[model samples]
Every structure is written in structure tokens, then in C-alpha cells.
Target: SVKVAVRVRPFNSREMSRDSKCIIQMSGSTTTIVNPKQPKETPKSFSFDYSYWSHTSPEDINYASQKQVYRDIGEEMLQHAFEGYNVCIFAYGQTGAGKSYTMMGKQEKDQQGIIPQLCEDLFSRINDTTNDNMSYSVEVSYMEIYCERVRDLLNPKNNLRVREHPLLGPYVEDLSKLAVTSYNDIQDLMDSGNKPRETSSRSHAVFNIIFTQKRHDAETNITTEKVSKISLVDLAGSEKEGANINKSLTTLGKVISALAIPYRDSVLTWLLRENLGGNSRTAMVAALSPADINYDETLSTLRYADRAK
Candidate 1:
């Protein structure tokens, strides 16, 4: 089942200095947003698998921590991966709405986001296995889509072509897939890949992990293999409109609406064909702003998430 979750972030420096009022509320798995100008109108409410209330400090009773998010969402996806199923998790929201913060947080302790945390958990589990007949391998790739062009982050390349196979689905041609031995190896790669780049807010970034487990049976002299692909995506900010970003996002919306799933209409859609209701177990994290000033964008994000459900 595809899971949709929404998280509202704390007020930023500008919002705090301007004394912006919080217009979001969450009760269990339901989230409600109020229009600051229309006090008399009924608030809009939507329900999801998760409604993270992170709009306040840890002192608040409902503050959702990064660990909690991973425990709920990442752990389940990782479990599916261990079961030989492909999994994908993505974050979508407006600029400064905590999309990156939720997907790839700071390096400080307890601040690492879902991507790093999931990687750590995967390696930890793999290292704990002591079976002599079992072996595991992990390969990772990082790429971003800017202005409809695919750029490899691990091994720098521009305008990488995307091709589809009759049996293998879609893939980026000539993209680098580095074999990672441990969490530290992946961390180093991520550190280098996180270097500042232009138009980051306008580009969609995807981090993919291919996990393979092999088991050998001595009695039968047979070897069995199971492979799972885990895709973690941080999408470009979903603002109120650019020609490329908006075009792809619009195509994404149309695909979610089930209008023939015109995946080839955009590069983002084409690359994510398998994760978008195709064969993989997917999850969507809708990042949000809690200030009254972002009411329109917040509502739009909530509506988009609801449609995916």
C-alpha cells in the first residue's frame, strides 16, 4: 500500500520575527489548516497514514522527532526491502517548507534525516547477520534532474539519457553506481555529493540503493538471490509555477490522476514510473509551513497529497 504523510515544520527566522501565526493543527492522523483571513469559514482537514506535528519545540507533547519519523516510515520500508520488495520514499513541498530538512537533515547528532538514518539501519542489520551461507551487497547512485536534464552526482556527468527496457523498466544511461562496503563509505559519498549547486530548489534529487541478498544451500548446491531497489527522492519545491519544474510536476499530477499515466511526458515522471503506482511500495511525505503567510501553498500541498491517497 502507498502511504501518504504530512509534516508541518516550526516557524523560520523571518516568520518568527514577523510574529506569524500558526495556521495548522493535527489530531492523530488528521491535519487541519485554517485560513487566517477567514475566521468564520470551516477549516480544511485531511487524513493520512501520518500527520507529524513538528511545528513546535521538543517541550511540546506532540513534537515529532526525526527518529520517530524514521521508526514509523523508514523501518517499514526497510522491512519490505528485506522481504524482496522494491520501496520508495519521497518528500514534496514548497521552498523552505522543510523538504530537504526532512529528507536530508544536518550532520549533527539526532538530526540526520530519513536518507542517512535508513542507510545506517540497513548496514547495521547487515553487519549483525552471522550466517555463513548468506552474503549481501549494496550499490548506490545519486542523480538530480534540472531543467529536464539528468546529472549524476557521484560521478559528474551532464545530460545523461534515460532509456527503458522491456523487462528492466526505466534507467539513466551511463549513471555511476558505486559499490558501498559500509555506512562510512556511503557517508563520505553523501558528504561530497551535498556540495552546493545552483538551482537546487528547482531540481529534483534522487538517491537510489540496490540491495541484494544471496543464500547458498549446501545440500542442494544451489544459490538463490533476491534484489530490492530503494529510492529516496527529494523533489523540487512545489511553488504556485518554471517551465521545466512546473511542467514535470503537472505531469506528475496528471499521472497520479490516472490519465493514462503519460510518464514519457517528463523526465521526472519517466524515471519514477516504477515507484508511482507501478510495482514498488511507495511513501509520500508532504512537507508544510505552519505560518499563516503560506496558507495557499500549504493548502495546495495538502490537496496534492490527498489526491495521491
Candidate 2:
């Protein structure tokens, strides 16, 4: 099942200086976007599993912190992973809508995003308790899909291949999966200079955490293995393109449209359907900007997210 959530980011410096109109209103779990152009017509409204208000405000209750985002989305995903269910959380929005800032935020105090926070939380939970009958192993893999091509971020020089299994579904062949023992270990992968720096506009970056939980019984002298995967996607912003932007975003639109109303089994659509609509428990976080200049884009994003719901 896929649970959809919407998060509206605060206006940026430029938008704030421009004195943009605030067109969005949120109450309970519903989000409404006002249409200034056509006031006579009814505005659009969408209800989600959760609505996050990240707009800046002096009052603490009015503003949603990075920590709060993690608590609502990341914490629940982690809980499912512990229960041996594969979980995925994805971010969707236009350029400069705070997708990266929310999913893979700047590494600082009170600013660490979902990925870093999950690493920290998982390690702490594991260290806090040890079970004699059960053991655990966690490994991580990072990659980017650009123009329907998958590149290994951990080891960029190597070429990666996509393969499908009748029973196991699709997976990356020759992809580098590194063992991560602590949060710092995951940090090294994100901080690696080997990864491409300017692919945010055209790449869909996926961070994969593969967890293996094993139960050993002395009386039976047998071990049972339970594996769960947590896939976190920080997608490239959907934007008009030059050579600067790849076809990944465009292809994703096709995929979403198909899954929303409903085919290739290696392009963008296939991968997305697997992660988003297949057997795994999935969630989508639609990030939005409130500036009037981005009204068209915001409305389109909202509609797309609505269909996804």
C-alpha cells in the first residue's frame, strides 16, 4: 500500500523579498491551493494521509521542523522494516521545491534529513538492546538513474546492469553494496567525492538499506532468515529541460500516469512501478513551493500527487 503525504516548504529568500502571496491553506490533513487568477471558480483541494506545514513562522507550533518530518515519515518506515516488511519512501516535486533539502538535508545540527536520521536511529536502537536468539546485518547501496541509465555512485567507474528474477523481481547486477556498521559508515558514502555533483536536476538517486534478521534456535539447531529492504528515493526535480536535464523526469511522468490510471518490465516506468506500486509498502512525499511565480508548477505537481493517491 502507498500512503501519500504533502509538505509545503517555506518561501525562499528571493520569494520572500518579492513579497509573494501565500496561496496555500492547511487544516487537519487537507491542503487547499487558492487560485488568484480565477477567484469565481472553485479552488483545488486534496486530502492526504498527512500534511506537513514547513512554512516559516515565529510560533513553534506553526512550523514543522526537520526532526518532525523524520518522526512522522522516517520513524514509521523504520518500524515496518523491523517487522520484516520492505518499505520505501519517495519525494516528488518541481525544481527548488525542497526535495533534496528534506530527504537528504545538509549535514548539520537539527538539519540532518531522513536518510541520516534513519541511520542514526537504527544504530542506536540496535546498540540499545542485544538479543541472544536473533542477530542482524545491514548493508547499503547508493546509485543514480539518469536518462533511464543506472550508475553506481559508490564506485562510479564500474558499469551496472539491471536484471530481473522471476521470483525476486528486478535488481542491479554488479552494483556495489557496502557493509555499513555505523551511521558514520553511511555518511562516508554520501560524502564520497567519487559521486557526481551536479546530477540533481536529471538524476533519481536511490539509497538502499538491506537488512537481514536471523533467528537461531539451539534446540532445533536451525536458523531462519528474514530479509527486508528499505529504499529511500530523492528524485530529481521535474522541470523543463535542455541538455542539462535528462529524460528521467519525463519518463517518470509517464510511469506515474500509467500507475495512477492502470509496461516495460527496464526504463524509468518499470523501476518506479516496482518500487512504488508492487509488493512493497510505499509512501510518497510531495514537496511544494508557495511562491506565486511557481503557481502553475505547484498546481501541476498537486494534481500529479493527487492522481498518485
Candidate 3:
């Protein structure tokens, strides 16, 4: 019942870590570098790389693009989850970079962005009557975190707080009350929320509440409701002072960076464990976790925010 999802937004090969307490042989770096000038050492943008992205070797996949990195991690994740596993796709990158586009590109249907493609793929499989022996289905939930508050995209009228969801579903407080059960439903709902997307010189962030579908479990004849979720998260830029942020905002950014001071001072300086807000439980995340919003999307966005810079 434990699904740990970490989005590599300023994505590159370098970000690799271990629990220390738990040893699992790990070695491999991202073989894609969509942008070599992925911003570095600059307050304007954020990014990471191993010693280098693929200096060790070079092997491109069928989905790789010339000007992009890592064959679209979001698409790769969707592919991995479909084979049989719950998954999460989080965006991590600078404010103006391409985190949102990488994860949930907009209306250009021809572009065939990750979220849209995944939605189509899921329903296509669900509609396959011939595969009834191995049945499955889906649902959708949408949540947004503005400033420090959480709002359900589907239930936009409600001032729902961001908190944790139960082990099975993604919604925080009310499951059934805040879910989208149809592909068209979620698409329309996603559109509705995005209409008011907030962006500025400091942060550019948006999110989809969530879509939790109950896969079929024939054994109990209770196949009516069995849930499995794949969360898609697009985080706001972490730079805080993107193109232009005043003194106070810049100070806030410095404070966020100051959180880095402890990171270097702690037992480990690994990026994943850096705590921008001094929350010990959130230290491993390398950034601040919003106090108000609880949608996992917001969680991921906060996790990857300003990581590009």
C-alpha cells in the first residue's frame, strides 16, 4: 500500500539517492538532455545533472526528441505504470522552463501531450471488451493549491483543505464527493481549472486534482469498486522571483535557499532531504511542502518548485 513518487523536474542523471537504512543496488543516469543550457548557478532558473547527463554512455529510445531530455519522463512513467504498477508523475524545473508542458501540455491535440495521451490510452484499454478477462476501469479527481490553500478543481466552489488521502484513493477529505468518473468529464474539468491559471515573474504553477479509478476485482463479485490511482502533478516554479519579484518576495526566496544552509549542515546534504521550510518530515524533499494545499499534485509541484534554478 506504499507508493513513493518523486518527480525529477530539473531532470537529469545526477539526482540519485538511497534510504541509507535501506540498500537497493542503484546505478544509472538519464540518457537524455533536451536542453544542455538547462540553467545552472543562476537565480533565474534551476537544474541538475550527474557529473553529466550521459557522458558515461549514449543510448536513445524510440520516444526521444532532439531538443528534449530523457524521452519525456512523464510519458515514460505512464508507460511504466500501464505494464502493472501504481505511479506518480511530478514536474520539477525552473519557473519558465517546460515543467508544465512536459507533464500536461495544453490544447494542441496534434502535440499529443503526456496527460492527454495517457487518458486516451487508459480508456482505450478499459473499453476493450475482448480483454474482459483482465478487467479495469478509471475515475478522476482534481485539486489545486493556491498560495497556501487547497481547492478541488472539480469542486471549485468548495474551499477544501489539502491533506492526505486514504491508502487507496487520492482525494483528501471526501472521496466520492470529489471525483470525476469519465474521460470527457476530467478533460472538461481540467480545462475549467486551467482557465484561471496563475503565473507571474515569481512562480508559474497549475495542477489537475486527481483521477482515481477502481480497477476490477472479479473475485469478490464486488468488482463494482476497486481503486488504483496514478497521480499527475505539475508544480509551481520554485524561484519565487522568476522574471521579477520585489524585495520581500526575493527575501522569501533567500529564506527558501537559506533552508539550504541546514541541508549542508545536516548529516547528509542530499537534495531530496533539503528542507526549505524547516519541516523535518519534509526535509527529505529538498523544498517546502505547502501547509494549506494537500493535493498530491501540489505536493509534487512544491517538491520540484524552482528546482530548475
Candidate 4:
């Protein structure tokens, strides 16, 4: 099953200055968000596979840290990869709702997010293996979708075209796929490709890691191999409706809606449906706001997550 989870972030400096009151609360798997006791207001609630409260500091034992989110979600996806299944984990929500922070953590050593943490953990696991019959190969690619166009972040000079392959499904033509052997190499690749001006909310950033494992049985003199493609996507903000930049998100909604069944010409959703959901174990982390002022946006996000599931 495709898993859906929600995470609420702590108050930001702006929200703190505004004295925003948190309207959301979580108990077990359920999430409740109440509209302020305003004269004219309605309340809404939702529940999912996991309800995380990242709204507190470490002093609170119940606080959901970045590392915890990885354990709850990222680590499971890694397990699927080890079992030779295609995996995709992505974040969806309005801008500034902690999607980027959760998917790509801060530079602070202790705050490393899913991508970096997964890289470190994956390499460590690979190095820990001592089976002489097994060998591994790792390769990665990074790209972003902006203005309904695909750009190879690793090779920005190349504006790639989205193409469908009979065997490979959907892919970006001319995209850069580099072979890397260490965690630091992956970090350097991300740092070199990341554009400070190109924030995650405005563009859909995809980090793809391909793993290949081969095993040989000497007695039979036979070899078997397994391959898995793990895709981690940070989607664009979904609240900006009607903007040309939001076309991909709009298209994604349609794609998810038709997952079991339909599609426009949006590259993002088609790529997702054809590749990520085609033969992949997928998960969604729905980031949200706890403030009453952003009620509409938050409700819309909750509803979107429900529909996606």
C-alpha cells in the first residue's frame, strides 16, 4: 500500500512574532485542527498512517525530530530497496510548511535530513557487507521541474526534454547521471548542483539513486542480479492555484486521482505515474501549518492527502 503521513512544524520566527495560536493537535494516528473559537468558523480533522509533531524542541520527549521521521519512513523505503523494489518518497504541502526542511535538512550536522541521512546509512550498510559473492553499484541523478520545464541541476546548461521510453518508462533526455562511491561524493554533487535562488517550493526537485546487486553461486557457476531505483522527490507548493508555475502540481492531482485508472500532458505527474507508481513503493509526507490564520490552505492540503491515498 502507498503510505500517507502528516508532519506539523514548530512555529517560525514570523509566526512567533505574530503570536499565532496552534490549532492542530495529534493523538495516536488522528490529527485534529480546529478553527479558532471565532464567531464564524468550522473545524476539520484527518488521520493517516503516521501523525508527527515536529512542533516542539528536544526537551519534549514527544517531539518528532528529523531523524525520527527518517526512522519512521526513510528507513522503511531503504528496506524495500534492499529487497529489490523500486521506491519513491516525496513531500507535498504549501510553501513554508516544512517540506524542504524535512526532505532536505539544514547544513547543521545534527539536523541532516532524509537525503543525506539515507546516503550515509546506505553506504555504511553496503560497506558493512562481507559477502564475497555480492557486489554493488550506485549511481544518482538530480533534476528539478520549473515553469513546466525540466532542468538537469547537475548540468544546468542543459534544459532536458521529458521522453517516454518503451523499456525505461519516462525519463529526462540529456539528464546527468553520475556514478558515485561515497557519501561525501553525493553531498558534493548536491552542493554543486543546488541553486540557492531555486528554492524547493517553486520547483520539483528529484534525487534518484540506483542500486544494483549481483550474487554468484560458485557451485552452480551461475550469477543472479537485482536492481532497484529509489526516487526521493521534493514537490512544488500545492497552494498556488491557477499560476502557470502550478500546472505540474495541478497535473499531479489528476494523476494521483487516476492512479488505479487517466492524464493531461504534465511532465511531472506523467513521470510520477509512469515511473514512481508504475512499479514502486511510494510514500507521501503531508507537511502542514498549525496556525488558525492558514486554515484554508491547511484543510485543502489534508483533503489532497486523503484523495491521494
Candidate 5:
């Protein structure tokens, strides 16, 4: 339930077979996929499929048109996750490999990707299929992670960058929170975020955080918890070198290298100590907002998975 790879249909481009691996004549637009080393040309040539070209690279398993979700694989993901356990169905692959399209399908098609599809299914099943005794509610939030910083894609009026709070972690803030009702509500928000999002040649990652809460025994006098989160993260496609590194190339390279090779920089080394460096989780002195949430009724924090207990 953590990851779902959507295979995009391949182009009419001629690809080099495995045994006969040659160059592929891609039949797409003039948009040349930027590599770390090379500039672009009007019409580009591919030595291999750019999306899944290398195994070592962080390429998606699918191409442009082919797909991974065969109806069954996706529906099961939706059902299991909605039952209260945290789930993540993320689009994992390189850029334009349908990562965005898979999670949030071609908007114009009126067709749905996983997020939208799941929403429709959940509401219908909850109202018509559930035991009429139980009740459920849902809330959704969207955000984009650039470099290593997370930004609220729902901030209204002004999208302010709240600094990492001592108690909360990540760029946690509540002002940008969007209390959504229908799928279209979310779609409108996503459209706005998509416009100014920083999807400029890093990794092809998109995350949609959906929170579902279940009510047990409506008339019970006992206390119960409030909310829990299910996160679907489509991380940006990572590259060792990308975006034609022009004026900002050198600085960007330093950031990328430092992130890739933590041993090279102090900040990266300090931040990445979490993959189990044989330490008992310390009291993170400088807490990042949204990393861990504080409590509240009118809480303006990114408690992430923190439920209203």
C-alpha cells in the first residue's frame, strides 16, 4: 500500500531491444529532457527509454502510455487503506513518466487518477455499503516538497513560509490548511498549487496527504480518538546533475552533492542521522514544524499523523 507505479503508454518511438540495444527515435514534442551533462535540442534522440533507462537510477517502472494499475491492484489499495491503517500509494518514477498523471490523472479527461477514484469509491461505499451503524469523515491537504523543504500548497491569500517551530517539525503551519468537501474542491486547490509549484527539474515527486477518521458507536459515552493520516507521497525524481546548471548550477550542484553524499557536508550529515545511526532517538533540539505536531482544537500545526486523542 506504500507505493503504486502507474505505467504510461509508450510512444510510437522505436526503442532499442534488450539484445539489440540501440538508439530510440522518440516520436514526441520538441521538449528535450534535460540531463545533467547535455543541453537540449528541438528534436531529441534517446539512447534508451528515459523514464526507466537505468536500474540504478531513480526511474519509474513505466514509460509514457503503458500502466501498472490493472483496476484490481488499485481498488484493493483504496479499500485496505480506508479501513484506518495508514496507507501510501505514490507514483514512483522519473519526470513525465505519468507520475503526476497517475496520482492525479489527466485533468481534462474528467477521468480520475488514484486519489480522485478512491474518493468517489469511499463516499459511495461508506454511504451505501457500510453497516449504517458506523460513520466516517475525511479531510485532505496538499503540499509540495522542494529541495528538502515542504510548502503548503493550500495557503490562501498569501502563501507564507512559516519557519520550523520548536515543537512542530517540517514547515508546519495551519493557515494554509484546506478543509475540503468534494473531489472538485481538491481539484481546484491542486490546480492553483500546480501553477506556482517548484517542479523545476529536481525529482518527479508529488505527495497528497489524505486523512480519514472513523467514528465507532455514535451513542457511546466513552472517549475516542479523533484523526489519523494516510500519506501518498510521489517524491520528485532525483538527479545527480539536472537543469542545465547555469548561474545557479554551481550552488545547486553543491546542494545536490551534499544531499547525495552526506559524508561531504556537515548539514547533510547532521540531518541524515536518522536512518539508524545506532542511537536512541534524541530530543530533536531544533524541531522542524510538521515533523511532530503539538495538540489543539484550533491548531495551526502540521501534526502529520497526530490524531485528536
Candidate 6:
């Protein structure tokens, strides 16, 4: 089943300067957003697999931390990968609404988000498996889509081309997929890729992990292998609608709504064909702002998640 979760972030300086009031509330797995302009109208409510409250500081019991988010979404996806199931988790919302914060997070102590935590946990679990008959291998690739063009984050000099394979579905023709033995290797690669980025809201980024597990049976002298791909996507802001640059997002909405499974409408959708609805267990985290000023975007995000559900 496709799982959807929504998270409300703390007020930014702009909202604070405007003296924005929080119109978002959460109870259990339900999230309610009130219209500040219309005080008498009933608040619109939406339910999801997880509704995270991250509006307050750590001192608040209801505050959702980075670790907690990973525990609920990342950890389960990792477990599924180990069981030979392809898994995907993507973050969607408006710009500065914490999409990057949820997917890539800060470099501080407890601020590390889903991607790093999942990679670290993957290596840890691989190291802990002591079975002599079992062997594992991992490979990773990172890319960003800007203005409908795909650029390799690891090897930024190349403008990668999307190709469709009869058996493999869709893939980047020359994308860099480096083999990784430990989490540090992944960290270094990510750091190099992230060194050139300042504001990432206009582009969509995807980090892919290909995990392979092999087991040998001594009696039959035969080895069995299972492979799984984990896709971590951070989408562009959804504020601007119907822009030529946002064609992929628009196509994505259509794909999700009609459930067309229109896997080739846009580059992003084509590349994520398998993860969207075909062959993977996917999850979406809809990052949101609690400020009353962003009520429209927040509401649109909620409706997007609802459609995905």
C-alpha cells in the first residue's frame, strides 16, 4: 500500500515578522487546518498514516523530531528493502516548507534526516549480519532535475539522458552508480555533491540505493540473489502551478489522480515509473508550513496528499 504522511514545521522569520498565527493542528493521525480569514467556517481536516507536529521545540512532547520521522518511515522502508522489496520515500511541499529539511536535514547532531539515517542504518545492518552463507553489495547514485533536464550530482559535468529498457523500464544512460562499502563513503559522496548547492527549491533531487543480497546453500552448492532499489526523492516546491518548469509536477498530479500509470509523461515520472505505482512500496511525506499566510499552499499540499492516498 502507498503510505502518506504530513508534517507541520515551525514558523520562519518571514512568518514571524508578519505575526502569523498557526492554523494547523494535529491529533493522532488526523491533521486539521483552519482558515484564518473565515473564522466561522469549519476547519478542513485530513487523515494520513502519520501526522507529525514539528511546530514546537524539543521541550514540547508533541514535537516530532528527525529521529522519530526516520523511525516511522525510514526504518520500515529499510526493513522492506532487506526483505527483497523495492521501496521509495519522497518529500513534497512548497519552497522553504522543510522538504529539504525532511529529506536531507541539517549537519548538526540530531538534525540529520531520512537519507543519511537510512544509509547509516543500512550499513549497520549489513555489518551485523554474521551468516557465512550471506553476502551483500550496495551501490548509489544521485541526480537532480532542473527545467526538465537531468544532471548527475556525482558527476555534474554530464547532462544525462533518460533511456528506456525493455526489461529494466527507464534509467539514466550515463548516470554514476558508485559501489559503496561503508556509510562514510556515501557521506563523502553526498558532501561533494551538496557542496555546490545553495537554494534547492527549484529543482528535484533523487538519491537511489541499490542493495543486493546473495545466499549460498552448501548442500546444493547453489546461490540465490535478491536485489532491491531504494529511491529517496525531494521534489520541487508546488506553489507555482501550470508553469512550464513545473510540467513534471503537473503530470505527476495527473498520474496520481487518474492513476493513469502514465509513466512517460515527464522525465521525473518516467524515471520513477517503478516507484510510483508499479513495482515498489512507496511513501510520501508532505511537508507543510503552519503560518496562516501560507494557507493556500498548505491546503493544496493537503489535497495533493489526499489524492495520493
Q: Give the TM-score of each candidate.
A: 0.94, 0.87, 0.48, 0.91, 0.51, 0.94
lDDT (tens digit, per residue) of candidate 4 on 160-279: 788888886788888888988888988888777665325545788888888888888878978898998888888877773236446666655554545533333567776765344555
Kindly report which residue stretches of model 3 are placed more than 4 angstroms away from their true locations once superposed. Answer: 1-72, 79-84, 133-135, 164-171, 174-182, 198-226, 240-309
- Give candidate 1 misplaced runs (Cα > 4 Å): 254-260
What's model 2's TM-score? 0.87
Q: Can you list the residue pairs that collide in candidate 1? A: none
Off by over 4 Å in 4: 37-43, 195-200, 240-247, 254-264
* Model 2: pairs clashing at backbone N, Cα or C within 3 Å: none
- Which tens-of-lDDT digit does each residue in 5-114 have in candidate 2? 77888899877898877677688677788776765456568888877888775356787777888898899898888888888788888878888778887754658778
Q: What is the C-alpha RMSD of each candidate to the true structure, in Å?
A: 2.2, 3.2, 13.2, 2.4, 14.6, 2.0
> How should the candidates be ordered by TM-score, best one leading?
6, 1, 4, 2, 5, 3
Q: Which stretches of candidate 5 lie above 4 Å from their native place? A: 1-8, 12-70, 108-110, 129-133, 156-171, 196-206, 216-220, 240-309
What is the lDDT of every predicted structure here?
0.85, 0.74, 0.37, 0.78, 0.36, 0.85
The 10 consecutive residues of candidate 6 with the worst lDDT sum are 254-263
TM accuracy, model 1: 0.94
Give the count of colliding residue pairs in each prediction: 0, 0, 27, 0, 27, 0
Per-residue lDDT over 209-238 for candidate 6, one digit per residue giving the tens place of the 0 to 100 score: 999999988899899999999999999887
Between candidates 4 and 6, the one scoring higher on TM-score is 6
lDDT of 1 at 10: 98
